[PDB]
RNA sequence: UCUACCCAUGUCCAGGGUGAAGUUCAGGUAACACUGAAUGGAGGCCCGAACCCACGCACGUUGAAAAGUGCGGGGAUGAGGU
RNA sequence: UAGGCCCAGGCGACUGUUUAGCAAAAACACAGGUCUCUGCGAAGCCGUAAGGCGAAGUAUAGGGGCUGACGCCU
C-alpha cells in the first residue's frame with residue numbers, strides 16, 4: 001500500500017531526541033483539511049513534558065466552518081490551537097504573545113533568579129509537504145529556507161536566529177513507519193506529503209470521486225464543462241481527448257490540489 | 268519622436284530608437300571633414316589610463332563653428348544633418364558671401380531661415396550676440412567663458428541657460444545644473460535651446476548596441492579580489508554666486 | 514597546436530638586428546660584451 | 558559629597574602622542590597622570606565634538622581598558638557643532654564603528670561651556686560603580702555555560718568541565734578544560750559575549766582565565 | 772614570433788526555413804486601432820556544411836602525439852573567425 | 854547521409870565570457886534601476902617634470918560605488 005519511510009526520517013527522530021533539552025516551546029504543524037489524520041502519534045510519544053500549540057496551516061483551501069469547529073474541538077480538548085495562512089500573514093502576528101504567555105512562568109522564575117530575559121527557543125515539527133519552512137521564511141522575512149512544491153525538500157535540521165527574540169529549529173517531515181487505517185493513508189496521499197511515485201494513483205482518484213459524490217454533489221455537477229453523475233469513472237474521464245485510458249487519473253488529482261474546485265475539507 | 272520595436276525576439280524586448288524626423292540629407296560635405304582615429308584609453312606612453320573604452324564603428328570628424336564672429340553677411344540654413352561625434356544635430360549654413368559653415372542646431376530651426384550674428388542682430392533662435400545686448404529672461408546656449416574662444420558651456424542635447432542680471436562689467440547667468448555665476452560681458456552666446464530634446468528617453472535594449480557605441484564591460488570591485496574634490500583654494504571662486512548644492 | 518616559434522625574417526631583424534642594438538645604450542653594451550668574448554656572430 | 562555619597566575626582570592634564578613628546582622633561586608629568594589610573598577605579602575619557610575622532614584617542618582609551626577599570630566614554634563641546642535630529646546618531650554610530658574593543662561603555666553627551674546635561678554624568682558613574690564590583694552565583698553561572706556550548710558545538714575537541722568566579726573587580730572567571738591550547742581567541746571572545754548578555758555587566762571589562770584538566 | 776587587451780588597414784561564411792516595420796486594397800467607420808488580401812525582407816531569430824570551440828564515453832598513458840584519436844555535441848550575419 | 858518524445862519542481866530573464874593542460878556552472882558580463890563627484894587648464898588617472906588620456910567632448914556629458922530583464926509588494 002503506502003510504506004514510504006526513508007532513512008533521513010529515521011535519523012530525524014534521533015536528532016530531535018538528542019537535542020530535546022535546549023527546546024523551550026514546540027509548534028506542531030497540522031493540515032487544516034485533515035486535522036485528525038495529520039497528527040503523528042509516533043513523534044508525539046517522544047514529545048512530552050513540553051508545552052505546545054497546534055497550528056492549522058493552508059487554512060485558505062479549507063472550509064472556514066469546519067476548521068473553526070475543529071479549532072473549538074482542540075481548544076476544549078485541553079490544548080491551544082490556531083488557524084494560520086503561511087503564504088500571506090493572516091494569523092502570524094498572534095503567536096509571539098501566545099508563546100510569551102505560555103513561557104511566562106519560567107520567564108519570571110528566571111528573572112527573579114537574577115538573570116536577564118533571553119530569546120525564546122522554538123522547534124517546528126510536522127508531516128512533510130506542510131508549511132514548515134514557508135512559515136519560517138515569513139516569520140524571518142528573509143527567505144532563508146528552501147521550499148518546493150513536492151515533499152522531501154529539506155533534509156537536515158537547521159537553526160534560524162530571528163532577531164534577538166526567537167531561535168527557531170526546522171526539521172524534515174516525519175511519517176510513522178507503518179500505516180494502520182487505509183483511509184488515513186488515502187487522505188494523506190490525496191493531500192500530498194507522499195512521493196506519489198510509490199503509491200497507486202487510481203485508488204486515490206477513486207476515493208476522491210466517491211468522496212465528492214457523497215459530499216459535494218453540486219461541485220461534482222459543475223466539474224469542468226460536463227454535467228453527469230453516473231455510477232462509474234469512465235464517464236467523466238473521457239471528456240476532452242488512442243486517448244489515455246486511465247492516465248486522466250493524474251488530471252483528476254492534478255486540479256484538486258490546486259483548488260480548481262472550491263474550498264473543501266475531509267475532516 | 269520615439270519608435271518602439273515589437274518583441275519579435277528576446278533581444279528586442281523594450282528596445283526603443285529615435286525617429287530621425289529632422290534630417291534632410293544623408294551625405295556630409297567633403298570640405299568640412301577631417302580624419303579621426305580611435306584611441307583605446309591609452310596615452311603617449313601606451314599605458315591604459317581610462318577604463319571601459321575602446322572599439323566601435325568608425326567615425327569622421329565634422330568641423331563645427333563654435334566661435335561665429337562672421338558679423339554681417341546674413342546666412343540661410345541649407346540642411347540639418349546627423350552627427351555621430353556629439354549628442355545633438357548640426358546645421359549647414361550657406362552664407363550669402365559664399366563660404367559655408369556648420370553650427371549647432373537649436374530647437375525649432377526650419378530650412379530656409381535667415382540667421383545673423385553680431386551686436387546688431389535681433390533676438391531670435393539661431394542668432395549670436397554678446398551678453399551685453401541680450402535682455403533679461405531669455406534662454407541661451409553655447410555660452411562662452413573668455414572672449415575669443417568657442418562655446419565652452421551648455422551645448423549638449425536639450426540643455427539651456429538663462430540670464431538674470433546685468434551687473435557692471437559682467438553678467439549673471441544660471442547654467443543647466445542650477446549653477447549661478449558671473450561671466451565676462453564681452454563674451455558671446457547663441458539664442459535658443461539645443462534641439463533633439465528627447466535624446467534621454469532612448470533605451471539601448473541590448474548588450475551589443477553599447478558595444479557599437481564604444482563601451483567595454485565593467486567589472487564590479489567586490490569580485491576584484493561624499494567627499495568634495497573641488498580644490499579648496501581654486502581660482503574663479505569669487506565668481507560663483509550660488510553653489511550647486513541642488 | 515601552435516608552437517611558440519613561428520619564424521619571420523622582418524621581425525627578427527627589427528627586434529634583434531644590428532641597428533636596433535646600436536640605437537640605444539644597452540644594445541651598445543651588449544655589442545661590447547659580445548666583442549669582448551670573441552663570438553664569431555654578433556647581433557642577428 | 559553627592560547624593561549623600563562622597564566622591565574623589567582627579568585631573569590628568571591631558572596626554573599627547575609618545576613619538577612627539579620629546580620635551581625638556583616637562584612630559585615627566587605624564588608619569589604622574591598614569592599613576593592616577595592605578596589609584597582610580599572609574600575612568601572618564603573625554604572627546605571633542607567639534608573635531609572628529611582622532612587616532613590618538615583610541616590609543617589613550619587602551620591604557621584604561623588594559624588596566625581592568627570601568628570606562629565611561631564622554632564627549633564635550635557640543636556648542637560648536639550642530640545640535641539636530643540624526644546628528645545624535647552620526648557620532649553615536651561612528652564611535653561604535655571605531656571603538657570596537659570597548660562596547661560596554663555607556664555614551665554620554667554634555668557641554669561644559671553651556672552646562673547642558675552636566676548633572677547626568679554622575680548617574681552614569683554610580684551605575685558603573687556597581688558593575689565593576691559584582692559577583693554572580695556559582696550555580697547560575699555554570700548553568701548558562703553549557704547552554705552556550707550546546708548551540709555552538711564547535712570547540713581533539715575541546716571539553717568544558719567547570720566554571721566559576723575568582724575576583725570581584727574585575728570579574729575574573731576560570732574554566733577547567735582538558736587542555737587550554739585548544740582554546741581559540743575567537744571562541745574565548747564568544748564566551749564573554751554570552752556572559753555579558755546573560756546579565757547586565759555594563760560599563761566594565763571582563764577577563765577569562767583557563768586552567769588545564771589538573 | 773606563444774598567449775591578454777588595444778590601434779591602422781584586408782579578407783571568409785554551401786543550402787534551406789520563419790515572416791517585423793513600412794506600403795496598397797479594403798469589412799468597420801464619418802476614417803480609425805482593428806479583419807483579411809497582396810507586396811515587403813527585419814532579427815546579438817531557427818535547422819544545418821566550410822570555419823571556430825571543447826559537453827559525454829572509449830582508447831592511448833617507457834603513447835602516432837611532453838594534451839591526440841574515434842563516435843556523438845555547441846556557435847555558425849555576429850558582444851563573429853582570421 | 855537527415856530531430857527520439859511527453860510531464861513536475863528549483864536556479865539564472867535571454868544571446869555571450871571564464872581556471873591554455875581536472876572544475877563550463879547557479880560563477881563573470883549584460884540591457885534597466887539607484888547613490889555620489891565634476892562649471893571646463895573640469896573631476897579622475899599615467900608620469901619627478903615636461904607631456905598626455907578624459908575630448909576636441911561640456912551636466913540629456915563624463916569618472917567612481919551598489920544592484921541587475923518586465924509585471925504585481927519594498
Ligand SMILES: Nc1nc2c(ncn2[C@@H]2O[C@H](COP(=O)(O)OP(=O)(O)NP(=O)(O)O)[C@@H](O)[C@H]2O)c(=O)[nH]1
Nearest residue numbers: 058086129130131132133134147149152153154173
Ligand atoms: N496555499 C498554501 N500553500 C502553502 C501554505 N504553506 C505552504 N504552502 C506551500 O507548500 C510548499 C512549501 O512547503 P514546505 O513548507 O516547504 O513543506 P515542508 O514541510 O518544509 N517539506 P520539507 O520538510 O521536506 O522541506 C509551497 O508549494 C507553498 O506554496 C499555505 O498556508 N497555503
